Amino acid sequence: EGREDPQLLVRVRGGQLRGIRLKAPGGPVSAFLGIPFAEPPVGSRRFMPPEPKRPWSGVLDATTFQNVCYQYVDTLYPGFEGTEMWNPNRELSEDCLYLNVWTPYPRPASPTPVLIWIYGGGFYSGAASLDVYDGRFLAQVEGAVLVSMNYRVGTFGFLALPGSREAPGNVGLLDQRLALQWVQENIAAFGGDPMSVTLFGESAGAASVGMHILSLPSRSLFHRAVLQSGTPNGPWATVSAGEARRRATLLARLVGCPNDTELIACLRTRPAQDLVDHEWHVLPQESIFRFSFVPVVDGDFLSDTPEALINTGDFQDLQVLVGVVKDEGSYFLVYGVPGFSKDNESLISRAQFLAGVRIGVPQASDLAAEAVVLHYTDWLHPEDPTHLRDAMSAVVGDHNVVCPVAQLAGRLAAQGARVYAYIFEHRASTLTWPLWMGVPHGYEIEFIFGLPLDPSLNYTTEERIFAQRLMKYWTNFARTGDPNDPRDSKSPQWPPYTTAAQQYVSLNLKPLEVRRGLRAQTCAFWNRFLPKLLSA
Amino acid sequence: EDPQLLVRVRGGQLRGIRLKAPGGPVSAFLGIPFAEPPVGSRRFMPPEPKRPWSGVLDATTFQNVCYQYVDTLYPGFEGTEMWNPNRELSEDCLYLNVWTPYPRPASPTPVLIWIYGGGFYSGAASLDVYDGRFLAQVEGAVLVSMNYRVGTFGFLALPGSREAPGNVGLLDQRLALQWVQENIAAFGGDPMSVTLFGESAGAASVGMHILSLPSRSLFHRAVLQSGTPNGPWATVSAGEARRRATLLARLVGCNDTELIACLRTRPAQDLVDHEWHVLPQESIFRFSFVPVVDGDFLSDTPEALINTGDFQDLQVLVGVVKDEGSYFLVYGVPGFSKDNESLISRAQFLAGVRIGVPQASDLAAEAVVLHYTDWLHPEDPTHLRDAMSAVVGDHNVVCPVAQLAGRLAAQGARVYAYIFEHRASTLTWPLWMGVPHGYEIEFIFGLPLDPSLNYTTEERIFAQRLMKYWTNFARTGDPNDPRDSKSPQWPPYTTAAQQYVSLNLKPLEVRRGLRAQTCAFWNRFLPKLLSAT
Ligand SMILES: *[C@@H]1O[C@H](CO)[C@@H](O)[C@H](O)[C@H]1NC(C)=O
Ligand SMILES: *[C@@H]1O[C@H](CO)[C@@H](O)[C@H](O)[C@H]1NC(C)=O
């Protein structure tokens, strides 16, 4: 060293780092990108729990995003911004366990609350390096220290032969936990406060955050949690040991690998792409919003089902922010339900609605399905194509996200957690998905990370103010366990969600509005009746 | 003597009586026999036509009420007593009543025929709320009402037997309708324009006549107030009728011929003493002896008949009151009383549902509770009380009515539908009951026009409007006035638009969908559920 920027040089447990000075609209920030936090999970380590990164020598360059974890790449709409913004933006590799850090420039004087982002992508995809996850705005405007980590996805992350030593399951979550430990040990070197760590994540990332809440070894590695449109409970976030063993065994067959040791050994000789090419082929039914390789109820990371754990856990010491977007279901319809397309209005028939329900509620017997159809039919207009379209969207959204969220918020509150709840209702003026899809899941993220503050992205002035509000809510919550601004009582307040009053707020361009009951009547159907109905 | 009061019918001559109506006199012919007394060995048997009589038969007075259970829950309370027999009880009760304007109509006048309710176990055509003088004087209508056998005397059935074939109470009704065809012209009535209207069990009877071919040549239009032939209480199967009858016989000390012989030796009150004891479950809004699917009067179940019937050239007026269910809760459901607010616990709500839906499995009862619970206020006493009322009224009346309305409309009938929402200022039931079942009748019969009954001026005006709808419907099959050119019009109920109107003090308001989401639950989902169990 000698001529370099002295303010970009930092040591962590494994060695010296060189970061980069990024420009944000309001000033510079410090970024440390591609920090390895584990031994590369390759070769004989595929499917294995991660091991801490062995110290390196010299100054590791941390100025560029590293490899993204090997994964399926979406090709439904080739060249379309709405899909490609989620696609991997670095080389695919099994050597992918790296994390990223953004901090104020210069680094903060006093220790600073830390935000840790966990991406979604259905546990089969995702990357911490995507543009929508750019931590530079939160770091500059709110002074936050922001960490995001890559974690293994798909088979590499979640293929399990439960009980085995060579593929114990949930290693993708163990990747996440290793990164949380990394933060505890090392974040102070960046000016971050290890005694104030908030997890936040969207979709499968949100479910992941929920896993960490429910798994005892993770509990001492964070203090607060934000869950955006996802939950550890619900029909897609976990599988039984039995089902995971079935899926892993089937996948092995599909790639030529017919004792768990011998089988896993043969899978470890397969090229990564061969696994990805067959991953989607092991699902039990024709479905949407179901993923082949996800966290497994192993009796270890997860001592029991998330449902049982949220129903009996003690959460007196927890502060949780949760919420949903207005149209959780619309996105998935074009990926599997006949009649739906992003290029037309997707007006479907009654027949297509019934068929859609069987695909969107794949575990339902004929009776349960009919119950769903009867509940969601508008009997004043049972054949109106526009209603059926919107009803299909509501079915998929309610079943997979809104009602699992409503359940989680309710159980957490009842058991001593401080819960704050929202529904996000603003549609980005820059959205490229059609208008009928409303506010699809994933499209609040860019507002929470403050992308509209970047002039070049052509958001509205109103959207830039809105984005600032949201960043202020999230970082206030990070700091205090309370999204409300202390030095501001004039603005309307965000009350805690309680079982008695079930209050939550609308997040849009208009000031905070307090509402009661998260789809209360409908979620009673999904969360109380349907389980009893499927028991017959 | 007054020649306006002297009439010759096929059986001989009658003397009626001139009655005072607020706006003028009417001719009343009360207590006209239309059958041989169904006594002794005629008990449980089909009625026979009345034999000719000599001289002038005095028809200036109401005849006896059919032998029936008499309610004693609230002794001396108007809200219950107003439904109790106001004449002596007798198995000798097959008489009918006729009101005409005074003088007798110059031209043949549409006839309205009232069939009372009473759960098929009670009722009488002589009740003050069924007084026909108002419709006769004001709308110039000819009004007929008959007594028909109720309880065991009218509906005890051993299916396939000669001496208790079932449904004889409905045959009583049919004989009266036949009598009207043969005789009503002598009163200035038009036999080619006969409208049946009835309430609750009466409405369900009207419905039966719609579904029974021999009845169809005896009327042209129908009004069904808060009752239907379909639904869970109006009919029993042949197997269940047989069961209840043999249980009753065992309870009073008795092959079919001998069984029914011994029953016929039993004093009337002995049968009534036990009739409420043959029900298969602890229930409310369920009745021991009701019409039976005999494969004769009813060739098949009402549902099967409404599903396949052809109903063109039929016009129907159907409706419900705002709170069909509130009445019955005080008769069975714990926690409910007319003497307090009846604010129930959640546990009491679950208990009430098993009573109010006695046929429901555990799963089905759970579905009902989950559907009617207000999950924003799941434990609020006021909500649970009002939900209990709703469960009972929806299950037994509102959703059966919606099903009938939809089936008739789909299969060619002209249907008009209403909900009645005005609560009488004179009502003596507590406020929480709202507008209970039965309390639209006084308005339709035009009782508020009687100054001494202390109704309000607005209620008088209202009564007049209802009398117009009903008689316009009798005249034409369409409740709308052909002369009035002022909106809003009462549109026909259809399966597509599902339009109905609200009957209250405000002008007609058109609404779409009769509790359509909730009735889909009852009419479409539950039967798949109780089936799979
Ligand atoms: C929309 O387009 C898709 C394929 O392009 C098609 O399957 C679907 O039927 C269309 N829907 C409508 C309402 O046109
Ligand atoms: C923003 O709008 C300008 C209009 O001149 C256009 O040139 C630019 O490409 C747009 N950028 C984005 C990211 O949409």
mmCIF file of C-alpha atoms and ligand atoms in Angstrom, chain A residues 339 341 344 346-347, ligand 1:
data_model
loop_
_atom_site.group_PDB
_atom_site.id
_atom_site.type_symbol
_atom_site.label_atom_id
_atom_site.label_comp_id
_atom_site.label_asym_id
_atom_site.label_seq_id
_atom_site.Cartn_x
_atom_site.Cartn_y
_atom_site.Cartn_z
ATOM 1 C CA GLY A 339 -54.999 -18.456 -20.157
ATOM 2 C CA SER A 341 -49.934 -13.977 -20.405
ATOM 3 C CA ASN A 344 -52.721 -9.783 -23.180
ATOM 4 C CA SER A 346 -55.523 -12.662 -19.392
ATOM 5 C CA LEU A 347 -59.327 -12.742 -19.230
HETATM 6 C C1 LIG C 1 -53.192 -14.662 -23.989
HETATM 7 O O1 LIG C 1 -52.101 -15.252 -24.745
HETATM 8 C C2 LIG C 1 -51.800 -16.614 -24.406
HETATM 9 C C3 LIG C 1 -50.609 -17.028 -25.246
HETATM 10 O O2 LIG C 1 -50.055 -15.948 -25.990
HETATM 11 C C4 LIG C 1 -53.027 -17.493 -24.644
HETATM 12 O O3 LIG C 1 -52.742 -18.820 -24.211
HETATM 13 C C5 LIG C 1 -54.235 -16.954 -23.889
HETATM 14 O O4 LIG C 1 -55.390 -17.720 -24.217
HETATM 15 C C6 LIG C 1 -54.474 -15.479 -24.223
HETATM 16 N N1 LIG C 1 -55.581 -14.954 -23.433
HETATM 17 C C7 LIG C 1 -56.474 -14.072 -23.898
HETATM 18 C C8 LIG C 1 -57.545 -13.660 -22.935
HETATM 19 O O5 LIG C 1 -56.420 -13.628 -25.040
#
